[PDB]
Write a protein that binds this ligand. Structure first.
Ligand code: C00
Ligand code: C00
Ligand code: UMP
Ligand code: UMP
Lengths: 313, 313
């Protein structure tokens, strides 16, 4: 089945992974250096054995593809995937007054979880309808939108890294320099989250576009399914714009890990039986992906087992 | 045998690789996305089935480790691996007078090869003994020494990327952010050679340092053996400085390819039988690798079959 390599990865870290301390003081079981392939000709790698909301994937990737870094666009699609990072600079700012919000994400795991959900609703509506607030606390800064489409240069300017590589694929498809990078040595030592999706690379041979992601670290239970779909989607999108058929998505990992408190959740999922893979439908009559909207992308026959509970990693 | 994964890679591209046009107008047989592992506890991955001069590896890696970008240091060790790039800016410069040196590297493949070797001897001695010349034509600029140790920042400064990551490994060994990057989006669109060794990543779990290289494109016959040894050496060196034992070197590839005119050479080599792996000896009494000299690194029991002829890729 198309998602088997995901299920083998979970199972490999289960059986032969070693205990590794981590930055968050959860325990992990970890392996270093791993590689999965997904043949995109065969269908779309949205796990069927655990629900992954494709609406969430596509709205975030479109956020990225527009060069957007403000939570507002996500919110207008009720995509709450980055909310907690924006909240960070609201709570801790010289403009915040309210109840205690230190360790917010950490201590929300049982009575605090009630007032927290309260301030987060006040923060979301405010970002939605208060432009100056949005500008100050809604904008994430150095997230994948700027890195891909507005990369800051030593000379004061800004480089459209992904735009330029697409023209390269169009014009020199056989080039082995088709790299988009999210890793800025000037920025990583002090940034909130150095990008886990460090670098990707396009490849064209005989009508097919492929992509390989180098992911420096991977939460197997929560992150990976979402990460497979984002970058498999991007492969399709870029193929679509270049008039190419779709090849493989290759997921390469640095530290691929299972958090200690996701062990039961993973055992639950491994006893589930993969269902026929959904198929991706892209707008046949629109090709300029930076101008893509939600309706331009549709998934057919997605048939997941339910979502599985977590504690957040 | 320790080098089997190299021999399987050659054999995989032989049997299931597809013909791909390239930048140099040679033909290639190519595959996209590949991953080899070398257990460094088992011995040193210097191919025995084809001679790889370790002297050349170590002098180049020391060049890098010092932040050096001038051909002069290489030359003092009779390391001619980068000469042709420096020559480039001499021949084509507003200071060159002599016989025709256009396409120099390309047309040197039968009577031209005599006068070319002549100007290259005049260029090498000149760089060796003429400091101002050395400064103008000996210095390569944006090669791995600056990228690793003097990375230029938007604010006019220069970042010691590799120095800083070593302190990180020392101080936060379990960090999943131990990345050194050679890929600068500001520089790649106009540079002579965008680095093939795009990015590497360190990993520590239970006393062992590992490293993974993301190599964007790989000449299997000429480049790869040299590339395995460079980065396996760096793994040992960094382990040595951090007081760690050695784990795995993981070589990950974008476009791993066999040039069309290296097919016989590769078939010759596959009929050779791997010999017991050499063992690496590092100075037990010196640990600061940026202060390492040639004598600080020794290889024991290296026992290669002869070198194999080529046309240069
Ligand atoms: C990089 C970055 C930055 C901020 C915030 C998130 C991420 C991120 O990667 N994710 C994420 C969430 C889920 C998830 C899983 C179950 C339920 C809800 C969300 C799954 C995969 C993910 O990668 C973030 O929420
Ligand atoms: C990146 C870069 C830049 C300039 C110049 C060289 C390289 C390079 O990688 N090499 C190289 C040479 C040989 C080689 C093979 C047989 C004989 C002599 C040399 C093997 C592997 C190599 O990677 C360069 O010469
Ligand atoms: O898109 C993402 C973003 C984050 N992570 C996970 C990996 C790590 O568990 C954690 C990041 O922590 P560090 O690697 O930066 O330490 O989040 C993912 O898996 N995918
Ligand atoms: O250290 C190196 C440097 C270069 N190459 C090879 C790969 C390609 O065949 C060629 C570089 O050409 P491009 O990938 O930039 O097109 O040199 C290597 O294998 N290893």
């Amino acid at each position: 089945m198309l998602e088997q390599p995901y299920l083998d990865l979970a199972k490999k870290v289960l059986d032969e992974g070693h205990f590794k301390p981590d930055r968050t003081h959860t325990g992990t079981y970890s392996i270093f250096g791993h590689q999965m392939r997904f043949d995109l000709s065969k269908g779309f790698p949205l796990l069927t054995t655990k629900k992954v909301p494709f609406g969430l994937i596509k709205s975030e990737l479109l956020w990225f593809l527009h060069g957007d870094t403000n939570i507002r666009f996500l919110l207008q699609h009720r995509n709450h995937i980055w909310d907690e990072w924006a909240f960070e600079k609201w709570v801790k700012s010289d403009e915040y007054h309210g109840p205690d919000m230190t360790d917010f994400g950490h201590r929300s795991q049982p009575e605090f979880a009630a007032v927290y959900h309260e301030e987060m609703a006040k923060f979301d509506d405010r970002v939605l309808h208060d432009d100056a607030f949005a500008a100050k606390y809604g904008d994430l800064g150095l997230v994948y939108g700027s890195q891909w489409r507005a990369w800051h240069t030593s000379k004061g300017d800004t480089i459209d890294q992904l735009g330029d590589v697409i023209e390269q694929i169009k014009t020199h498809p056989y080039s082995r320099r088709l790299i988009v990078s999210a890793w800025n040595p000037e920025d990583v030592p002090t940034m909130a989250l150095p990008p886990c999706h460090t670098l990707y690379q396009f490849y064209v041979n005989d009508g097919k576009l492929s992509l390989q992601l180098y992911q420096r670290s991977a939460d197997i239970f929560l992150g990976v399914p979402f990460n497979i779909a984002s970058y498999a989607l991007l492969t399709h999108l870029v193929a679509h714009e270049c008039g190419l058929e779709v090849g493989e998505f290759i997921h390469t990992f640095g530290d691929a890990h299972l958090y200690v408190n996701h062990l039961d959740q993973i055992k639950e999922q491994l006893s589930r039986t993969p269902r026929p893979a959904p198929t991706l439908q892209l707008n046949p009559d629109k090709h300029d992906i930076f101008d893509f909207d939600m309706k331009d992308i549709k998934l057919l026959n997605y048939d997941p087992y339910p979502a599985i509970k977590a504690p957040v990693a």
